[PDB]
Amino acid sequence: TGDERFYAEHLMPTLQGLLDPESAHRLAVRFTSLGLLPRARFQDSDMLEVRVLGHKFRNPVGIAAGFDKHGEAVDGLYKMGFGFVEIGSVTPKPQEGNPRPRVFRLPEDQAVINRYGFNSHGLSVVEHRLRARQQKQAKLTEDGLPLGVNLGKNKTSVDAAEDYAEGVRVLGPLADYLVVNVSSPNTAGLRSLQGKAELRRLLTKVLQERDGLRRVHRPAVLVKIAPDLTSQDKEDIASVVKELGIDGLIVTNTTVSRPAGLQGALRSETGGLSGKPLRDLSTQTIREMYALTQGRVPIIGVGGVSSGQDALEKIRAGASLVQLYTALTFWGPPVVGKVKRELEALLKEQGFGGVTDAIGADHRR
Numbered sequence: 001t002g003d004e005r006f007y008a009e010h011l012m013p014t015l016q017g018l019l020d021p022e023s024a025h026r027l028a029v030r031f032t033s034l035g036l037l038p039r040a041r042f043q044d045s046d047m048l049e050v051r052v053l054g055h056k057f058r059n060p061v062g063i064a065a066g067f068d069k070h071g072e073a074v075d076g077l078y079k080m081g082f083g084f085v086e087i088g089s090v091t092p093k094p095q096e097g098n099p100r101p102r103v104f105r106l107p108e109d110q111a112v113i114n115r116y117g118f119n120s121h122g123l124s125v126v127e128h129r130l131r132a133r134q135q136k137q138a139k140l141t142e143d144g145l146p147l148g149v150n151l152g153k154n155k156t157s158v159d160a161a162e163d164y165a166e167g168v169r170v171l172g173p174l175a176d177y178l179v180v181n182v183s184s185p186n187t188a189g190l191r192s193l194q195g196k197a198e199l200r201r202l203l204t205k206v207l208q209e210r211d212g213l214r215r216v217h218r219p220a221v222l223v224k225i226a227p228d229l230t231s232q233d234k235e236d237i238a239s240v241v242k243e244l245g246i247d248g249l250i251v252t253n254t255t256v257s258r259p260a261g262l263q264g265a266l267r268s269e270t271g272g273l274s275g276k277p278l279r280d281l282s283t284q285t286i287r288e289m290y291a292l293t294q295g296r297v298p299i300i301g302v303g304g305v306s307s308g309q310d311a312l313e314k315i316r317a318g319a320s321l322v323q324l325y326t327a328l329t330f331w332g333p334p335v336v337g338k339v340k341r342e343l344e345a346l347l348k349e350q351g352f353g354g355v356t357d358a359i360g361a362d363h364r365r
């Protein structure tokens, strides 16, 4: 479309030339929360519909956690054409995160590095914000537009499991699914929650708390993992997920690795790397996790998705749904309709009746 080319070639590069990435982020959230958007003309066709996690998803393209950390722009994100929205990560108490600057653009790599450090309005603020639109969300969900909430841990928390449990109790009743984020590269000690004994204990507590919620307010629980795990780590996660009956996996968060070939001047900043250099690392992690769980655990695939081809590669690797974030920062709102339109065309070209038929297709070749 003309909007796609206009955003990608004119509007977005101009905004990027004028604003540091954090200011750009804050502006994006503001414009989105106000519905000031090109408003996609793409009608979701039936072949993009997916049923998973106890819900219908009108299309399989979601906005990844971190864009709307505090639940301020949920409705504008659906207007942008996302099939589902994940907010967060949200921590129990409000916290400021790391000192600025803490977000860095690598335009030559179509990548971002961030070290926000879980800046969060906290559970109470987000709870009230979601309560104010709770019935509007119930309608959206019923119409195939579910809401996910991603939970984090405070920097000074003395008991990680109790932080997550508090999030389940407070935001679980407002969410279609919850994500236990044990994969931020930007909170000391967080990723070691991915180890076997620690993960089993943590997830047992989260699931107990979830199961204690009333039936209509009981969300699916997913675990979001890093792309930097050892083979042993991945095996252990797969085993725990199956033992406890975890509902799904989100694969993957940002990477602390710095792949050979990064060109951006800021490539050596501390933080998680997202965008194109993460893409195939994430796809391969999806492929491994799908195999280790025998295709029985739904996976949301995320990392470097910017086109229908990228989305379909993750779906064929084993993802039931995909998310993007970094691509929005480069291409702007029209990227959402672009991914959906290209995905539909490719499904047709590859002889799939719909997204559902393509899930895990590479493992059946």
Ligand SMILES: Cc1cc2nc3c(=O)[nH]c(=O)nc-3n(C[C@H](O)[C@H](O)[C@H](O)COP(=O)(O)O)c2cc1C
Pocket: 064, 065, 066, 067, 069, 088, 089, 103, 112, 114, 116, 118, 150, 181, 224, 252, 253, 254, 274, 275, 276, 278, 302, 303, 304, 305, 323, 324, 325, 326, 327
């Ligand atoms: C600026 C920024 C902030 C993020 N914040 C969070 C977060 O709070 N919680 C989370 O689980 N993931 C967070 N992520 C990770 C994204 O959800 C996603 O896993 C990752 O960026 C890979 O997708 P992408 O390549 O499409 O950006 C963040 C990513 C970025 C770039």
Ligand SMILES: COc1cccc(-c2cc(F)c(NC(=O)Nc3cncs3)c(F)c2)c1
Pocket: 015, 016, 021, 022, 024, 025, 026, 027, 028, 029, 031, 032, 036, 037, 038, 067, 103, 112, 328, 329, 330, 332, 333
């Ligand atoms: C009508 O025009 C619109 C409407 C709605 C949204 C945008 C829009 C603008 C932007 F500057 C960005 N960029 C970022 O958020 N950068 C970053 C986010 N997190 C780390 S860096 C965006 F993603 C979207 C433009």
Ligand SMILES: O=C(O)c1cc(=O)[nH]c(=O)[nH]1
Pocket: 066, 089, 114, 115, 116, 117, 118, 119, 181, 183, 184, 185, 186, 253, 254, 272
């Ligand atoms: O807040 C952050 O720093 C953050 C959290 C997360 O889960 N992933 C990420 O890349 N950054």
